[PDB]
Point group: D2
Chain length 213, copies 4
């Protein structure tokens, strides 16, 4: 299962451990859908979230560094990112679409903003390649690359922690770009743990965009 | 996979996510096998202290053990726990009674046999009043306070590979109480079975303990 | 600053780093940044869910409590602990003996004075056997298993303000066992005494328990 | 408090607050045994020797750091810590970037002279910043306009970390195998750690420090 985000990014499921029943089982400490469904809802409305920690996912994410810097602030998880200082960086940058400026009245046409961003990316990237060819080590040359440069990482997180992620990132106050990734994460999560997801939206979700998608 | 520990405890594998290759893919940041090179990478990561890739291998265990063992176990914070509630459940007549062989190598003023008898007696008495209290109408959360530390409890433990190795370093060591050493050995066996390459690399480059290299599996 | 809990327990403040303004500094950095606004800033953070700035306030408490209380307390993983060892020290004769009032509000087949009496009996027999075992040469780590969960233990707790507020939401709640509720009240008071604005803001916008909105400090 | 060390061309590491010291570790450790300058210190060495690191968690520090984003990203990977950072989506970012000096290139035979590399990095940074300012004045949201800024832009953050976690940070960053720039900041953190917790620090170097530059 893979979901494309922004112009060249993505979120794909690598592996998963357990399902809704994993939480049920842990809550009873042992080893009827209606009996289980109801327990899941019971645990969710009373704030008993530890049972949901026994469900874990591993995602493979392709995102712009500026989205990554926000994403990595979630410490109750595991990460492994590509090493920019020990591998030639690919020519992958996030170039917003003109619809990204929609709502904002700017001095210049949104499509012009799109153009200026591409320009910087190119000059920056060329300077980079120029630096490497000259013999300047990667760890140094890449420091002139912009924040929209794409990076990839593996993310392992438990269900409780994932729900913490969505409360903060699947919300209109978060930057739009990461919101998009959050929706993708939300969808994959819903697929693997429908019961836990249903209950989350109803009693614990503090966000606002999932209640409308 | 279920292993018996002590007189009434056990270690059982509930679930597991990934294997040795999960660390390999995590380190390369590529979602796609070459034994030689994969194993070589595992050893490399273990040898240079790059433990983050191993956090992508996760286990969920179901454990039955004495409370005095759980208290030491629960000290490992990078893990998830779910234990039976004594304040929300009638506890079962199950306690750890050390075998006479447990005081072997110790000079005592009474036969090891007597120690077992003394321990078994108080336990029996303590449990007795606990029941009298329950029938009497005394709330469980209050009635169970007269129950000794050797009472058995059960929990679910979800821990990633890295954190599990750190557990082995401290518990699968002769300096840890004998009773928890037994559980760590059981953990190690299951760990060895699921991630053989990582385990071997662990023993070879990072394990700080002293028993996992003198006792098979 | 020491507060007595139960019959022989306590909550004592060992050290503290920062205060309400520590959280103010942190949050400021975000906007490249007062005075009376600082107090209003704290409410802004508390009400809109910006908890990270409070992680910069830290506490170290010295706590004496029954083991059955310590075990629930230690479940809070975002903190640091160091406790009295039952295998490295000769445990002292000190157990939690509920007062008759503890049952007040419960129909009991036997008088509260009786329940109270039965607990003491077990405690005494258990400790009795404990000393006998020790006297006989039985290692401390084994001998203590006959001791009940109402035995008092001591530990140091270092935790930040955000994690502390998390502890209060859960323990400073009538759904938690009465014994730990009492400890939570002492912790709440000390926290109120060191970070009045943060605490005040806490009860008003983020506190999810009940007892702290009816009980003072 | 007070302590401040300058790093690179425009960065720094400032000690904001500290809780406890060596004895804090001694005390915490003592509790286990229900329990002298000579003995207390011998204990700290004992704890380090055998790896009993829990006691050092009762020593906490609060730092104020100003460093380029590429260094900060590496830094934020340390999870047992608290952070608060300058927001690129909430404030107009200043014209401050890490410009490697010519000597940073020493040891490397490069086509164009080091001075030149410095020049070219300065130029690209200048164009990127001007485009950033241009889009800002044009009404483009800050969170969107700052995406054209290079990774050598300076950021600022507060860092609250305990001594054990701090020794963990040094084993990885206080090492020649880590980028030079992170090494410099790591060396600064170590200096302050040393000043405030001599015994713990000195024992660290002797029985646990897995690095090679301290
Ligand atoms: O020395 C290093 C190199 C890499 N990374 C992690 C930091 C980033 O999260 C990601 C990209 O690193 P760079 O190689 O580009 O610095 O990998 C580190 O923590 N330390
Ligand atoms: O109110 C409660 C009940 C249970 N537990 C956790 C504590 C122990 O780790 C385990 C068993 O607790 P008891 O119910 O026996 O106290 O579950 C708590 O933290 N708080
Ligand atoms: O080998 C040991 C000794 C102590 N402790 C921690 C466990 C408890 O939190 C407290 C008291 O332990 P006991 O010595 O009573 O087991 O210290 C351990 O985890 N392992
Ligand atoms: O919505 C936000 C804003 C800030 N930050 C954290 C991310 C960085 O560590 C630092 C600055 O982020 P930017 O505002 O530049 O994205 O604060 C987030 O995680 N999410």
């Amino acid at each position: 299962m893979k979901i494309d985000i922004l112009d060249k990014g993505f979120v794909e499921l690598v592996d998963v451990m357990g399902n809704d029943l994993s939480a049920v089982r842990a809550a009873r400490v042992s080893f009827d859908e209606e009996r289980d469904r109801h327990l899941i809802e019971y645990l969710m409305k009373h704030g008993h979230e530890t049972p949901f920690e026994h469900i874990v996912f591993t995602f493979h994410v392709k995102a712009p560094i500026f989205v990554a810097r926000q994403w990595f602030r979630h410490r109750i998880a595991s990460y492994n990112e590509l090493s920019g200082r020990y591998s030639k960086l690919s020519y992958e940058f996030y170039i917003p679409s003109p619809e990204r400026l929609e709502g904002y009245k700017t001095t210049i046409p949104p499509e012009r903003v799109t153009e200026k961003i591409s320009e910087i990316v190119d000059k920056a990237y060329r300077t980079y390649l120029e630096l490497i060819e000259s013999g300047v080590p990667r760890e140094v040359a890449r420091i002139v690359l912009p924040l929209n440069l794409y990076t990839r990482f593996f993310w392992t997180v438990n269900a409780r922690s994932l729900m913490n992620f969505l409360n903060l990132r699947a919300d209109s106050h978060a930057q739009w770009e990461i919101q998009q990734y959050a929706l993708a994460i939300a969808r994959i999560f819903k697929e693997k743990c429908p019961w836990t997801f249903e209950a989350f939206l109803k009693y614990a979700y503090k966000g606002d965009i999932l209640k409308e998608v």
